Design a protein around this ligand. Structure first.
Ligand SMILES: *[C@H]1O[C@H](CO)[C@@H](O[C@@H]2O[C@H](CO)[C@@H](O[C@@H]3O[C@H](CO[C@@H]4O[C@H](CO)[C@@H](O)[C@H](O)[C@@H]4O)[C@@H](O)[C@H](O[C@@H]4O[C@H](CO)[C@@H](O)[C@H](O)[C@@H]4O)[C@@H]3O)[C@H](O)[C@H]2NC(C)=O)[C@H](O)[C@H]1NC(C)=O
Ligand SMILES: CN1CCN(c2ccc(Nc3cc(=O)n(-c4ccc(Cl)cc4)nc3-c3ncn[nH]3)cc2)CC1
Ligand SMILES: CN1CCN(c2ccc(Nc3cc(=O)n(-c4ccc(Cl)cc4)nc3-c3ncn[nH]3)cc2)CC1
Ligand SMILES: *[C@@H]1O[C@H](CO)[C@@H](O[C@@H]2O[C@H](CO)[C@@H](O)[C@H](O)[C@H]2NC(C)=O)[C@H](O)[C@H]1NC(C)=O
Ligand SMILES: *[C@@H]1O[C@H](CO)[C@@H](O[C@H]2O[C@H](CO)[C@@H](O)[C@H](O)[C@H]2NC(C)=O)[C@H](O)[C@H]1NC(C)=O
Ligand SMILES: CC(=O)N[C@@H]1[C@@H](O)[C@H](O)[C@@H](CO)O[C@H]1O
Ligand SMILES: *C1O[C@H](CO)[C@@H](O)[C@H](O)[C@H]1NC(C)=O
Ligand SMILES: *[C@@H]1O[C@H](CO)[C@@H](O)[C@H](O)[C@H]1NC(C)=O
Ligand SMILES: *[C@@H]1O[C@H](CO)[C@@H](O)[C@H](O)[C@H]1NC(C)=O
Ligand SMILES: *[C@@H]1O[C@H](CO)[C@@H](O)[C@H](O)[C@H]1NC(C)=O
Ligand SMILES: *[C@@H]1O[C@H](CO)[C@@H](O)[C@H](O)[C@H]1NC(C)=O
Ligand SMILES: [Ca+2]
Ligand SMILES: [Ca+2]
Ligand SMILES: [Ca+2]
Ligand SMILES: [Ca+2]
Ligand SMILES: [Cu+2]
Ligand SMILES: [Cu+2]
Lengths: 707, 711
């Protein structure tokens, strides 16, 4: 009976058929509609309100209605409109509601709609068949043209235009590499396209870029080339390793270290609920916001209503226009939408339990992305804790750290983003993310070096920053929370017993924060060392029951406030902020900012405002990221090592004593026992590890949906 | 003739007993075992490896030369004399020594003052005797009353303050008093009695007490405390003795339930250890353990090429504040007792994975018997549970390419009083190297007195968790593709600009910002200072694509605040005051600390700041000096023990245009397949084979533990 559980195939098949009948016709499958059509872009879970939800959970109350959110594209009509419509209740839908207005204020400018597959495709279409053949000449001598342009292929960018309501997208051309990253094979050609018009047939090419010069059309370029005024240089079709491959040329070795659970796995999962000895939670994946978990309960007490990914950012600098304009708000494509199957044994431990995911986006029928999350429990080869006494008393006590883990990955164009949430035995929670995949590359010539590093022959690794945003709804000891800030200080001070003769005196600096703007820290200026959300309540020794936040962020220096685009993602400007949780401030960003961020559909900076945070339902907003100047060793992919970024939620006089103390798996003995005695040291046991070892599930793979 | 010798190995027992014999002889008139030794006695305190000059070493390993004389270094206390000194002695050539030289003035420029020498075990006992026998006796009444004092001792217990004194030449320790708990930490059970003992004189008879402090009050002596108490005049607080859970135990009352995940190598280890030298398919190196300076690795080679000559713990710190005299005046310089010396056995299946491979370590400290420490190090390969890299292509072409990150690890743990420090080192398949250090163990705790809360939190009853900082210095002698290295700082910048193709408008132009640091002080960054996103050392040489070949230093501190430079003391750990420095590598710029700084940081044997001195760092043998740390404000969840999670702290050494492509491209365990293929095929995918093969896990070694004290 869970209510944070993403929608089933049956629930979607159910909502869709409800929409369809009750939107008359005019209705087209989003899959292949033109701008001028009506179509259903997204049907996905609508989150419930916190009040009714807890009421339901912690007090028997019947559960709040189970509702869905349909994003609908209203092409056909002279006031073309994107409407967010709520549909309910599930499982048998019977109502529908244009929230659009009351959500944002207006209705939605039809140009904030993100580009459909059909649209993307009609654009390629025009390029490959109207436009490109006007330089068939140049592109022969440049880069192997023939006969139409099956050898080449394009990539989206940025926001699309320079001011609000533009729909003007730069595209690069890359050799259509077979079985590797095309992303590294930028041909040197970039095309600004104007697909704003509802009639694609009215679409344009506002500008063109080749080898450092701008033009106003393709044929105008070719003209110039033919005039002999342009040193074309041939740019290799194929090659060897790294750039050109992902297949390792070396053969496989001895097999690598493998973890197994000698007697059963010690967690379980049905639905989207996970249950372990210590931990409990629901989980899932918003189409746009992506990963998230709910009702996280440790030994049965709830710590967080919700932790969810809000948004992700990538901001470039560059030689070319496409790159120097490009700033992706990847949520405006969808981490849900673009999530990929976990390849058993590589993305996750071989023996993880892998879960499927369902969606109805840009289609009329629901679909599954297999092996979309994995859950598992992992040994770190670290002790959680450990003491060894050879002084005064001879004994040892310690405990190895196992950990529980939930992972999804979202492959976005070139990047593969890894999303981690990690549940510790100490009661702590670690959220972490990693950038892998391939990188975004430009073509090389001259200016380079202010904008990055030749990472390959002809290829420029464009500089950029990654950044990411998390909503963190801690309900430390129940809802009313305060926010505290302890740091340290030294104080010059004569030494009591002999004062002349001074001593630097270490001291704590505790301090409460009433107002939103005190608890709101921008990149650049310093966090206090200890910062946590406390409760009204006290632990046993008389301290406010706390949970500390602790970031691991390397601070991609953020886009100037000064910029017109800025307010489309002003969360990048903050490391940490805290806020009065409101039902109608449910997100940092939104899908509709990607395409018009000059007029942001959501603007975070608003959430901060005079308001008090002495004893309210708080919510913290954590921002995490780093600067990525590419280098040769991002070839082919960029590795995870030292790309960890996230933060820690940590008990802080929340408990009365570290709960590991009550661990099944801790170990103790004193010199004067037989340390190798089964009922003295549980490790002295184990002997026989099953009949023979892991019984491994035969390896499968998700597939390539749209496969 | 590629020089295939060991020379970064610490000594064997033979090697020690040999040197010990050598010295026995050549000192003769009145030598004593140190474990028995007086103040006025003469003493071999330590004998350890003395490591080679680099010149010679490299010549040997690289241009197949003859390797340098293996030698050793002996610390000797010349107490039996008119002007007692400490002396540092070199003894070679091992294995059969035949010569001995004094380097005490070579290195330091005078003799060493004798009070700089560490406190011997013998001393500690003479001190404990003075206390438990000539003093607490005189306050029988108080103690009978508060602290259960049955005429004896197996009752209370002392523990030692940081620097002993407050001015150069002093040797006066504040000593806390606490309950002899059996089977758990005594650290928490302070009775609120601290005693300022003065144990300078070389006649312990002459040793005195200079102050008392009892539960928040100062008193001139223990007599003058009964004086009060008995005359009704002191308010006593009664401080229990038995208890349950947390503070009193370390033993889980709940029974063992199912088996944690377990890690095993389905066909053979994929690395080997051969004494000091570890070697795997890609990494190869020597390791060891300094007695005081602690863990260290050498001659690290990825795929045959060397990146670092040496990485090596330099010092550990802990600065306390508090309410008590003890705590408020503790700044521990843990090297002055020694992170080698106080290493402890890694407890198999807790401190490393069960199937790791564990390694004994030998030493000769405060004795004449060489002794061993069983399983002091562990080494192993670990499946991290990540991928080093994946990419899944759904668009244009269907394919997957990925690699789960398995990594290689070397560990040591140094239990120093309360602390259990863990020291890692982790060798990622990308050619990266992760240094990493945790604090667990127990908390140094004062007795709780009213005005707390700007000295910590309340933790058990009567139990204050005093606040402290943690530093740990490291030495990184990168030799990046050659000895001659430069230092680069790259970073980012926005510059606002007209939009080229529609200059009506304006964009923020993101830009890179390389800057070469010529001089030492340019590359010397203080704690809480602005700090180059990309910083690395590099060769004149350069990769295929033309960028200089480089290794990046990427830090992970939450670093405490430094003891103020105002203080007459920071002298003794100037390294604390730096995020990071870079420096010309010199042979007499070997350690940044010295065991002898602990007991005299007003006259520091080694002051790291002198190392920064206006020199070029352009195209030299450069060595980097990373400092890592964090603020600890204890709390209830540090009971019974402090916990790793989030207390890990260190740095990364990451390649940066050093290669021409990510080395892992060629890995064996790499995986790839196209959309048009079958991924369930052994011939497409190694992982298809892990049901049929990879069944049968090893029968496991029956637990052995390496024991306590002197084993
Ligand atoms: C953005 O764009 C959307 C999409 O256009 C606008 O919303 C739509 O437009 C009207 C509100 O301005 C609504 O017109 C409606 O037409 C419905 C007709 O049939 C319905 O028929 C089904 C059975 O098939 C019944 O169950 C329903 O009860 C309806 O009757 C009516 O509900 C209703 O009535 C009339 O419409 C007819 C033409 O159908 C007129 O000729 C007549 O004079 C009268 O107006 C209703 O007015 C439409 O419902 C609405 N759709 C939705 C889903 O909201 C948004 O209004 C735009 N947003 C903004 C802020 O402007
Ligand atoms: C029934 N299928 C679905 C429609 N098909 C299809 C395939 C590729 C595209 N084009 C794109 C899809 C796409 O998802 N993206 C894209 C992905 C992630 C991000 Cl962050 C941004 C864009 N891009 C395209 C596309 N970009 C340029 N050209 N095409 C459109 C339709 C093939 C047949
Ligand atoms: C075979 N041995 C004979 C000498 N023994 C012995 C035992 C304890 C001590 N006293 C101490 C030893 C000691 O190592 N430490 C200490 C430990 C870690 C750190 Cl960083 C600093 C000191 N302390 C004592 C001690 N402190 C206070 N009283 N005694 C002296 C001699 C018993 C076993
Ligand atoms: C430190 O102590 C040692 C031994 O107490 C001193 O060594 C003696 O030095 C004298 C003259 O310098 C020699 O003639 C003796 O033969 C040495 N005796 C031994 C046993 O080595 C040493 O000189 C002292 N160092 C300093 C700098 O004063
Ligand atoms: C880019 O190259 C790939 C590689 O083949 C093309 O996709 C395929 O090509 C054939 C014709 O479409 C199919 O029969 C193959 O089965 C299919 N290959 C794979 C690996 O899935 C792709 O269409 C090419 N170009 C463009 C513009 O998409
Ligand atoms: C003003 C305010 O916040 N009141 C609350 C009260 O409702 C609650 O019962 C109490 C719990 O101890 O904490 C406080
Ligand atoms: C140290 O100082 C200068 C800069 O003033 C430096 O260039 C030089 O190498 C040193 N001094 C002298 C006098 O040469
Ligand atoms: C914020 O609130 C207080 C009282 O609620 C009010 O008096 C004050 O003027 C406000 N200040 C600002 C800067 O908005
Ligand atoms: C503390 O208890 C132990 C039991 O192992 C005992 O042997 C020891 O001597 C006791 N007291 C002291 C002061 O060492
Ligand atoms: C106190 O005595 C022992 C420890 O010495 C403890 O285990 C026992 O349970 C305690 N007392 C009582 C009354 O149970
Ligand atoms: C690099 O170092 C110095 C430059 O000052 C020179 O002696 C050496 O030959 C140089 N080598 C290369 C490959 O540039
Ligand atoms: Ca607000
Ligand atoms: Ca909350
Ligand atoms: Ca120097
Ligand atoms: Ca060097
Ligand atoms: Cu990147
Ligand atoms: Cu600590």
């Amino acid at each position: 009976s869970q209510l944070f559980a993403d929608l089933s195939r049956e629930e979607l098949t159910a909502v869709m058929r409800f929409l369809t009948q009750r939107l008359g016709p005019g209705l087209v499958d989003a899959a292949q509609a033109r701008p001028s059509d009506n179509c259903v872009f997204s049907v996905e879970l609508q989150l419930p309100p916190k009040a009714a939800a807890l009421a339901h959970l912690d007090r028997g109350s019947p559960p709040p209605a189970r509702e869905a959110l349909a994003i609908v594209f209203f092409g056909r009509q002279p006031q073309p409109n994107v409407s967010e419509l709520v549909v309910g209740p599930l499982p048998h839908p019977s109502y529908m509601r244009d929230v659009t207005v009351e959500r944002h204020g207006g209705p939605l400018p039809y140009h904030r709609r993100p580009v459909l597959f059909q649209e993307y495709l009609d654009i390629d279409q025009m390029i490959f068949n109207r436009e490109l053949p006007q330089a068939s000449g140049l592109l022969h001598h440049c880069c192997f043209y023939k006969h139409r342009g099956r050898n080449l292929v394009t990539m989206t960018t940025a926001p699309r235009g320079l001011q609000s309501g533009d729909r003007a997208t730069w595209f690069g051309l890359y050799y259509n590499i077979s079985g590797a990253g095309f992303f590294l094979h930028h041909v040197g050609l970039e095309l600004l396209v104007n697909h704003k018009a509802l009639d694609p047939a009215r679409w344009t090419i506002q500008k063109v870029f080749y080898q450092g010069r701008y033009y106003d059309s393709l044929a105008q370029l070719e003209a110039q080339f033919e005039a002999g005024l342009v040193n074309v240089v041939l740019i290799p079709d194929n090659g060897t390793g790294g750039s050109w491959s992902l297949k390792s040329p070396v053969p496989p070795g001895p097999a690598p270290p493998l973890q197994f659970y000698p007697q059963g796995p010690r967690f379980s999962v049905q639905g989207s609920r996970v249950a372990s000895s210590l931990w409990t939670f629901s989980f899932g994946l918003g189409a746009f916001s992506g990963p998230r978990i709910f009702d996280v309960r440790f030994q049965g007490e709830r710590l967080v209503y919700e932790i969810s990914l809000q948004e992700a950012l990538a901001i470039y600098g560059g030689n070319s226009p496409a790159a120097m304009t490009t700033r992706y708000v990847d949520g405006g494509f969808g981490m849900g939408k673009y999530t990929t199957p976990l390849t058993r044994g590589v993305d996750c431990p071989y023996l993880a339990t892998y879960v499927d995911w369902h969606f109805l986006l840009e289609s009329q029928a629901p679909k599954t992305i297999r092996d979309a999350f994995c859950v598992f429990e992992q040994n770190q080869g670290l002790p959680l804790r450990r003491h060894h006494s050879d002084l005064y008393s001879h004994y040892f006590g310690g405990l190895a750290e196992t950990v529980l883990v939930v992972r999804s990955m979202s492959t976005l164009l070139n990047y593969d983003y890894v999303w981690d949430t990690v549940f510790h035995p100490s009661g702590a929670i670690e959220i972490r993310f990693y950038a892998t995949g391939y990188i975004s590359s430009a073509f090389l010539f001259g200016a380079t070096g202010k904008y990055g590093n030749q990472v390959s022959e002809h290829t420029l690794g464009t500089v950029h920053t990654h950044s990411a945003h998390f909503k963190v709804d801690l309900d430390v000891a129940g809802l009313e929370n305060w926010v505290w800030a302890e740091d340290m200080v030294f104080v010059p001070m004569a030494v009591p017993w002999s004062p002349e003769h001074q001593l630097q005196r270490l001291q704590v600096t505790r301090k409460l924060l009433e107002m939103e703007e005190q608890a709101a820290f921008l990149v650049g200026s310093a966090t206090p060392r200890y910062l946590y959300l406390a409760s009204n309540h006290s632990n046993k020794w008389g301290h406010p029951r706390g949970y500390r936040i602790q970031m691991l962020s390397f601070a991609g220096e953020p886009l100037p406030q000064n910029s017109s685009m800025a307010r489309g993602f002003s969360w990048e400007r903050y490391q940490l902020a805290v806020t009065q949780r409101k039902e109608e401030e449910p997100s940092s960003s939104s899908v509709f900012n990607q395409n018009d961020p000059w007029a942001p559909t959501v603007d975070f900076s608003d959430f901060i405002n005079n308001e008090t945070i002495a004893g309210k339902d708080l919510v913290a907003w954590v921002t995490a990221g780093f600067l990525h100047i590419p280098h040769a060793e991002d070839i082919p992919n960029t590795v995870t090592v030292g790309n960890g970024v996230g933060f820690f939620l940590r008990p802080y006089n929340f408990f009365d004593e570290d709960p590991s103390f009550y661990s099944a798996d801790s170990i103790y003995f004193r010199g004067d026992q037989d340390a190798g005695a089964c009922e003295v040291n549980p490790l002295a046991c184990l002997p026989q590890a099953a009949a023979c070892a892991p019984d491994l599930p035969a390896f499968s793979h998700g597939g390539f949906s749209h496969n």
